[PDB]
């Protein structure tokens, strides 16, 4: 029932969604009784390093505003040397979520979703930002449509490239990312959900002589897609242009 003011207008804290490191999510209501979401940032240990961090992420999420509706509405902020105040439009849960909730996943659903998916991951990559690590939790659900929350900017491994694993780096990575998130939408399991050991799963990423199940479906669209996506070589993976041009996002 706390209340507090961003910019001089007042919030009215409804109850708490998350909380990060020195980081806190909330839902709240202004003046004219609308609900959005807060989020409070201290930076009081943050160091010079972490700073400009959250300033870039911030700045990027208030210019990819104007290009997309699939990246999340930033209406206010107030910054300081204190701590930060995001007035954000507020979503109903994550993608994560609401997977890890919903036992049977709609074709429609499914489509509708992967299409929101690559028009963010799209806009973010004409800008020159590749997230570089995609999980469902880095989009939300807002009215029906999904949303991108963060630009790897400011952790589970199974969604990660295996570029990613060799770095021990493209727009072609995020298109690996995307490629095992609908994954889970279609199958209901990562391609290496299977392997309990995180040390055997990295090897096996990397692997390519180890066989990713792709099982015959009623939909062959998104098999050619989850195909098309999930292939070692970057440069053999298809991009982002291509995939928004595919039979499975664009015929009826
Ligand atoms: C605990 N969870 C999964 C929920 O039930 C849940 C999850 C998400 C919810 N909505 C929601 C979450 C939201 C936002 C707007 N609405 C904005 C943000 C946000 C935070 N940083 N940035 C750059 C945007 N946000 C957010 O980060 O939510 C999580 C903390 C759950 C990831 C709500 Cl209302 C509930």
């Not at 020195?22 to 240990?45: D, H, P, T, W």
């Not at 806009?123 to 659900?141: E, R």
């Not at 889970?184 to 399991?189: A, L, S, V």
């Amino acid at each position: 029932f706390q209340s507090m003011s961003v910019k001089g207008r007042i919030y009215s804290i409804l109850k708490q969604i998350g909380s990060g490191g020195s980081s806190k999510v909330f839902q709240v209501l202004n003046e004219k009784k609308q609900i959005y979401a807060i989020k409070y940032v201290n930076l009081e240990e943050a160091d010079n390093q972490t700073l400009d961090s959250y300033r870039n992420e911030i700045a990027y999420l208030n210019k990819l505003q104007q290009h997309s509706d699939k990246i999340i509405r930033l209406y206010d902020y107030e910054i300081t040397d204190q701590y930060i105040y995001m007035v954000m439009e507020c979503g109903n849960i994550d993608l994560n979520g609401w997977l890890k909730k919903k036992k049977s996943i709609d074709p429609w659903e499914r489509k509708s979703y992967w299409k929101n998916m690559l028009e963010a991951v799209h806009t973010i990559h004409q800008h020159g930002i590749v997230h570089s690590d995609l999980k469902p939790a880095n989009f939300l659900i807002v009215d029906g449509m999904l949303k991108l929350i963060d630009f790897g900017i400011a952790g589970t491994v199974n969604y990660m490239p295996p570029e990613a694993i060799k770095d021990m780096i493209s727009p072609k990575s995020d298109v690996w990312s995307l490629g095992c998130i609908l994954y889970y939408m279609t199958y209901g399991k990562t391609p290496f959900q299977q392997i309990i050991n995180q040390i055997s799963k990295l090897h096996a990423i990397i692997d390519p002589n180890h066989e990713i199940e792709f099982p015959d479906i009623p939909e062959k669209d998104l098999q050619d897609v989850l195909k098309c996506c999930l292939k070692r070589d970057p440069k053999q993976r298809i991009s982002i242009p291509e995939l928004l041009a595919h039979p499975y996002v664009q015929i009826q």
